[PDB]
Amino acid sequence: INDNCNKDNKGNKINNFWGLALKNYQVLKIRSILPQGGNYLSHQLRLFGINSTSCLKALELSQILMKEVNKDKDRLFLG
């Protein structure tokens, strides 16, 4: 049932990517072409990570990756 639910969710959220779809102002191409000190206000949304909470960004980039990466080849992770 857990695998079925995972498959259902990942096949259902194709149109809208979990309320995190990127707009046209966030992606740029080099060929085509901070505010107040240091504030950690973005960490209120990081509530599902114990060792490393940086698992929300992978969910955000997953749309672009599954758009343009092959799914039948292995992957390599550095650092």
Binding site: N9, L28, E60, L76
Partner: protein
């Protein structure tokens, strides 16, 4: 958490021969090991999430990025996607990395994530197509690189500022609307729960505030009472280390009490607590103790008047932990 239904544990391989220096990217041993282990198979994407310390100089960062590019050339076949993370710096000579990526990859996309911190210069580069033929030594390539044109520099800086402002506004809107909502979580949080991640509110509370549970408000009340009476008794009994330790204990007790009452009732007992946490410190005075619903007695307040008010400064790790705790209390409780 999933009970190994997807067999994720069995399909993770580690590149390691036993010798520690075969792991950092800037060494030749790591490249040799990766080439030896992966030259006979095809991989799709190379994800390089370096830590990017402020201590490291620009030369080291460019060296690591060149090493990652060379590794991708060596082992990566066609239709390979290189995902990397960069941290631009206010030092004017910072576009050498962008020139390097342009030189080695024709199709490079720069992305400013909205989930990441909108107050730090963090960007993600996705490179797809490659055209170079000969990978020259690191020294000559590093000496070859030059900065970018001023027009492009200003255009990129303006775009970065605009994207950061938009991301900050979106983050504030999401925080406010999540606090407003009654009892439902955002779709990405539910997706993370379905994938198998675990809520860290109880864990962070346990190993930062030393409170086994946050819903047992009464026990926290008596614990805070004992803590305040003990700290005042020791302070009037009498050096710097003991004062710092007891101040830390008192601040931790107050933070635990505030977290518990916000989680249960639905409102913090100090409207300035959120702003003080955001700027990165916690202040405890006699005024808010008096304004607090009567739990301590007059003698405790009079003894507190000897100290009056204290302000404790957290560092980056404690600020992150406290900020996550506040976010969890906001988004996992009644409005």
């Amino acid at each position: 958490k999933l009970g190994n239904v997807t067999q994720i544990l069995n399909r993770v391989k580690v590149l390691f021969n036993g010798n520690p220096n075969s792991t950092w990217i800037g060494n030749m041993e790591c490249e040799s090991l990766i080439w030896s282990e992966l030259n006979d198979k095809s991989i799709g994407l190379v994800h390089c999430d370096m830590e990017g310390a402020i201590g490291k100089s620009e030369e080291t960062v460019l060296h690591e990025h060149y090493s990652v590019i060379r590794i991708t050339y060596l082992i990566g076949d066609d239709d390979v996607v290189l995902v990397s993370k960069i941290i631009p710096t206010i030092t004017p000579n910072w576009s050498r990395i962008l020139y390097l990526y342009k030189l080695y990859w024709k199709d490079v996309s720069i992305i400013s994530l909205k989930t990441s911190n909108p107050a730090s210069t963090e960007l993600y580069l996705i490179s797809k197509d490659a055209y170079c033929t000969i990978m020259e030594p690191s020294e000559v390539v590093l000496s070859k690189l030059k900065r970018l044109s001023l027009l492009e520099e200003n255009n990129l800086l303006k775009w970065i500022i605009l994207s950061k402002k938009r991301n900050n506004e979106w983050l504030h809107h999401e925080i406010k609307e999540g606090e407003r909502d009654y009892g439902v979580m955002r779709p990405y949080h539910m997706a993370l729960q379905i994938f198998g991640f675990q809520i860290n509110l109880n864990h962070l509370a346990k190993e930062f505030l030393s409170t086994p549970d946050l819903t047992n408000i009464n026990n926290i009340i008596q614990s805070f009472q004992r803590t305040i009476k003990d700290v005042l008794f020791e302070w009037i009994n009498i050096n710097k280390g003991k004062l710092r330790l007891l101040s830390r204990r008192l601040v931790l007790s107050w933070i635990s009490l505030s977290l518990s009452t916000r989680l249960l009732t639905g409102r913090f007992p100090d409207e300035k607590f959120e702003h003080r946490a955001q700027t990165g410190y916690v202040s405890l005075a006699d005024t808010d103790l008096e304004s607090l619903k009567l739990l301590s007695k007059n003698i405790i307040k009079n003894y507190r008047e000897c100290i009056g008010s204290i302000s404790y400064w957290f560092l980056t790790k404690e600020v992150k932990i406290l900020m996550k705790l506040i976010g969890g209390a906001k988004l996992l409780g009644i409005p």
